[PDB]
Design brief:
homotetramer; eight-stranded parallel β-barrel; about 325 residues; GMPR (chains A, B, C); TIM Barrel; alpha/beta; 15 strands; binds inosinic acid; three-stranded antiparallel beta sheet; about 20% strand; binds NADPH dihydro-nicotinamide-adenine-dinucleotide phosphate
Chain lengths: ~325, ~325, ~325, ~325
């Protein structure tokens, strides 16, 4: 029942001389889409303040991935893709399960063929309705790679992969601005979830994303060491120039809003308020302004290269197999 | 030795599509009164700041229950009942073991025949005196549903049910303004208390209330998942317009008093003071003003519907069967 | 490896009706002095700010015990004894191992025959030198009851009782103003120390004092439940009118100094400062002023009566038999 | 998986009557250099703010050891050595693995023959490159005692001794101004590291230094109790008159900078800044000014003498043997 904070990685004898030797890119072949990936498998979350086109343009320079948020117009996507043809390779267009979500997704994918990834995202990936929607999307777009979540346990990972998803998004409640655990009491320790779900997915030649709960580069490295193919970040990418969220300067200091997608703040913006039978399951915070995201990416990547050197991993694909966790 | 903070509920595969589909009402048939209940089994605690007639009026609209405090006059009761006849089915009148308390209860029940629940409430329900009192109240009021507590272990749950109580109130020391544990060292972790006492009660076709220790909706869901038939709330319901407690406006902010029923504040108010051989076993806090309780009810119920969807429960009665706790 | 915080007492079926029914006095017959005791076995520590004459005078009225500090003159003792002839029964005169300490102790005992207890107190009761001192004091005063400490393990409890001590003082490092653990790393969790040492002592028909680490009446109740015959209190008794320590009014609030007997404050007062080879093993704090100690005594005794009613103990003597600890 | 905070020492019967009776010196014979040591085996860390010449001069008086930082020039070393001929016996010159570092060290050792210890110090002692370096250094200076680290596990302790190191420096991430754990997730709880590495070292009649994570005298005592031959201190020695770090008087209070050697502050000073592929693995703090280090040394040593009296150790040599740890919540 482990969280990131409960472990450390044991160092091991290595032949690496310098952190600059470490290759942080991965190559994957996806189970169902049959497409191939090559890049640095860290993903900007599809939160409205994080999965922005400005984030994408910077993350592209480092070969990182963006799951674009679901609140841009087709026109905005077309403007982005026209101005940034070389950044469409590691983007996913996102959708929930509504008719309207699906139709807007379609419009994007039809108009911008270079977008080859789909991020299907719900709070509760255990619903049969969600499973059925994944099948539906696989059938409509057989050659796109599908990321689907969220879940925390292997039976659901398997069902979702067998239903047509390529990459399962793992995590219920670990997120920095999530309040699901406080409102519902439901969840799973994130490191344990990653280990269980990685094993399940990899038994089927599928993949996973560790989604949420990382607050330092060491956490990112732990999720990878536990078998995550990709790691998705919200909070660590919030608060930058390139992030969304209002910039607030008060009492001589600068902040940016950062908020859960099921916070009252988000529901006020996009659902016309909070439905009577719902409770909010995210919160709002004000993040001290961090400046340009490039400096944060370099810190994260720098940390992970260090991790690899300490365990003797010359390439990110070696990190999990050379990871021995010490309980602390 | 589990508390609510030590666990999460595991999600499970679900045919539920929306949280709006979840029915939170239960029906119970009581062992000794032979009466039947229908409602949302969340009870406002019989504290003078929580179990108020203003609270009852609002909770009634949501089919929630109020254990009315023991400090209203007979005419206040008569006035309430006259003005709010449809509220009377979801209320209990309360008493401790004092001859004065019981006599005032008898006058209320004589005046208000519509009150069909009795809440017999002492700090130490392990006393043979309390056991005997319960037997006497059963003999006196054969058709009234009797809630009796408090205890934390099965042997006492069984004895209390066999002596004539329908519903056993579980918890010693977990309350937000309780200081019993600090003053006496006595108590029992609440989640374990609920698990153990639920098994003991259910084996005899009786019922329990998890009383105390919930500070968010997820805790309430954990209590129900652990087998509690009802959950009683003090602090979560304190600090509202409908709550008791002085409203205090100071340093630009508003607060409401909230205090334990064995605090010095309560004893000064209703015993004249603290008797020489006694210690206070409650504290006072100032709760930032919360506004109208309807918003808090909606949040709590919304959290629990979300729990139910995550574990596949279409009805609250299915929650405990569908609950697998993960240790955190 | 239990500290007080690690456990709660399980409640049990009781025939107690009222906390007023509980007798907190104990009767002891001491192994080596052959003297008898009757009183409430809580002791004000022999710290210079706690074991004062003003403290004794109040504690006396409750039948509590005072280990008088070792920094009164003989004239001071005679004055107290002359003015308070009925408060001499539950007093001890204190000494360390030095010849000047012994000479002063001897003057007190000779001049004040009503003083029938001796408190032999060193930081490190494991020294053969302390053992031999205990033996010598036993030989010199065969009808005086000897408290001796401090130690935390059974073997040493036994040695000290067999060397002539009646009551063994248990605790190394738990005290509120102690820094031994930070400075040395030496200690033993106090609840486990009490359980182990009480068994060792009782097997020889001797007694122990749980010395240090209580910060609420619940802790005192836990110590007694774990088998301690007496409980000694420093911090809980510091900061009262009757306490020593300078009264400091600053920034409109009142405080009283409270410091370790191994602190730099103490060694400056009574040694020539700190010897080059020693480190201080106590600290200084300013305790917000508590007023009269009577109120604190009532809070402590009331808490312990409540513990006894909860576990079915009519007498403090029964509390440890009736104690079942639950680990939290 | 223990840290210092997870344990206490159990007192035991003794015949000691005063803390002043306790002998805190140790004598060691080193496996590979064959040289001998007599002193109090607490070492000032080779951080630029701790392993200074001012520090060394004071620690000398108490028979404590200094691993000098690697950022003094030859001329500064010669000045020190000419004014303090007797303080040279418990000094180590430090180096990392680069050719420039090796050359600086080689000049110091050639110019000042009285310096008989070498501290080879990298963040990652698990590197084959580091092992080959230790071997090269043992080849070049066969009679110098070599401290080499850092590592946290016994296999690497063994390999480094077999490769020619005498004393292995143990600790990855426990340090007060280290952020390696937050940046990489890598580490090992320090008390357990010490117990494992001390067994591995001692099997081969080598020695270890517990490096990092001590924040009170008790932690020092615990490290010795777990079998560390030496204990190295950064934070506990920062903030003094003798420490490096700028003295900053602000808001009516005095502070001294103390920072990790992998911090942005250090890399700005000694490298070009931070290379694009590196992350900072240390932080900067401002430590309230502590005054003269002598007073801190006396507090540390008095603490450890007290531990020894409580467990019956008349000499520091006895402490580990007489140590029984109790696990604490
Ligand atoms: N990671 C997260 O927590 C995220 C949460 N949201 C939140 O999810 C909810 C639905 O989002 P929307 O975009 O309208 O539709 P989606 O496309 O996200 O599809 C989710 C569907 O699942 C249903 N549902 C069933 N169980 C749950 C549950 N336990 N928690 C949340 N939804 C559940 C919702 O219905 P119903 O609401 O009737 O129960 C909704 O129809 C909103 O409250 C939204 O703010 C949105 C994005 C990410
Ligand atoms: N559930 C919990 O953890 C707690 C609940 N309470 C709440 O606060 C109210 C405060 O009432 P309070 O004045 O404490 O007493 P109660 O209302 O519980 O007292 C009823 C009778 O129990 C007796 N009694 C016996 N043992 C105890 C004991 N250990 N603690 C308290 N009473 C005891 C009292 O006698 P006597 O006073 O002479 O001893 C009295 O005659 C309770 O009625 C309850 O609603 C209070 C504390 C803890
Ligand atoms: N509970 C506590 O921590 C108490 C602390 N004190 C402290 O104990 C020390 C001696 O007090 P004093 O009144 O002179 O003599 P004491 O009669 O209290 O006896 C203590 C004797 O034990 C010796 N000793 C051996 N080991 C230790 C140790 N680990 N810690 C403390 N003393 C030890 C002392 O010699 P030496 O000092 O040379 O080592 C001293 O001669 C002082 O520093 C004093 O402040 C006094 C009473 C109780
Ligand atoms: N003991 C500990 O917990 C730590 C100690 N440090 C202290 O700070 C200094 C840091 O300077 P720095 O250059 O960062 O490290 P080092 O002094 O340890 O560098 C020596 C060589 O090791 C290489 N190296 C390989 N892996 C790593 C790694 N994981 N982390 C750091 N270097 C690695 C470096 O190359 P390249 O830089 O190209 O990768 C460099 O060429 C150390 O010398 C040490 O004093 C720093 C962090 C942790
Ligand atoms: C719960 N979880 C939520 C909410 N909005 C987003 N998220 C989740 O958090 C992840 C990011 O976690 P960080 O710790 O910030 O990196 C997102 O990717 C998503 O899974 C919400 O309102 N409630
Ligand atoms: O003074 C007190 N001491 C201990 N428990 C109390 C006191 N007053 C009320 N309670 C308990 O605390 C419960 C509510 O706890 P909460 O919901 O955590 O605030 C009540 O229903 C009582 O059982
Ligand atoms: O300076 C000291 N160092 C360590 N223990 C001390 C010191 N001075 C007093 N004590 C102990 O602390 C006890 C009181 O502990 P307290 O009740 O937690 O404050 C005393 O009875 C002594 O045993
Ligand atoms: O920047 C850093 N990152 C990691 N460890 C460091 C850094 N700087 C110094 N250290 C280590 O920290 C030790 C001192 O730890 P301290 O005694 O807890 O402050 C040094 O001897 C080094 O091993």
């Amino acid at each position: 029942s482990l969280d990131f904070k409960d472990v450390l990685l044991r160092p091991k004898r290595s032949t690496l001389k310098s952190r600059s030797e470490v290759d942080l890119t991965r190559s994957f072949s996806f189970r169902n889409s049959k497409q191939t990936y090559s890049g640095v498998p860290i993903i900007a979350a599809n939160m409205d303040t994080v999965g922005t086109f400005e984030m994408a343009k910077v993350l592209c320079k480092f070969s990182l991935f963006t799951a674009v948020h679901k609140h841009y117009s087709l026109v905005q996507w077309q403007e982005f893709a026209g101005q940034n043809p070389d950044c469409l390779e590691h983007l996913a267009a996102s959708s929930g399960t509504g008719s309207s979500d699906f139709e807007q997704l379609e419009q994007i994918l039809e108009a911008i063929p270079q977008v080859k990834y789909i991020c299907l995202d719900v709070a509760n990936g255990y619903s049969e309705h969600f499973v059925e929607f994944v099948k539906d999307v696989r059938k409509r777009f057989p050659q796109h790679t599908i990321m689907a979540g969220n879940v925390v346990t292997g039976e659901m990972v398997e069902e979702l992969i067998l239903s047509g998803a390529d990459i399962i998004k793992v995590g219920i409640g670990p997120g920095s601005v999530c309040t699901t655990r406080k409102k519902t009491g439901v969840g799973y320790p994130q490191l344990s979830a990653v280990m269980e779900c990685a094993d399940a997915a990899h038994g089927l030649k599928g993949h996973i994303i560790s989604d949420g709960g990382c607050s330092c580069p060491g956490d990112v490295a732990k999720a990878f060491g536990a078998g995550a193919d990709f790691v998705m970040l919200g909070g660590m990418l919030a608060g930058h120039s390139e992030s969304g969220g209002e910039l607030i300067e008060r009492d001589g200091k600068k902040y940016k809003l950062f908020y859960g997608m099921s916070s009252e703040m988000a529901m006020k913006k996009y659902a016309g308020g909070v439905a009577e039978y719902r409770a909010s399951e995210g919160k709002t915070v004000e993040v001290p302004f961090k400046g340009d995201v490039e400096h944060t990416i370099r810190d994260i990547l720098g940390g992970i290269r260090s991790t690899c050197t300490y365990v003797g991993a010359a390439k990110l694909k070696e990190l999990s197999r050379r990871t021995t966790f010490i309980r602390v």
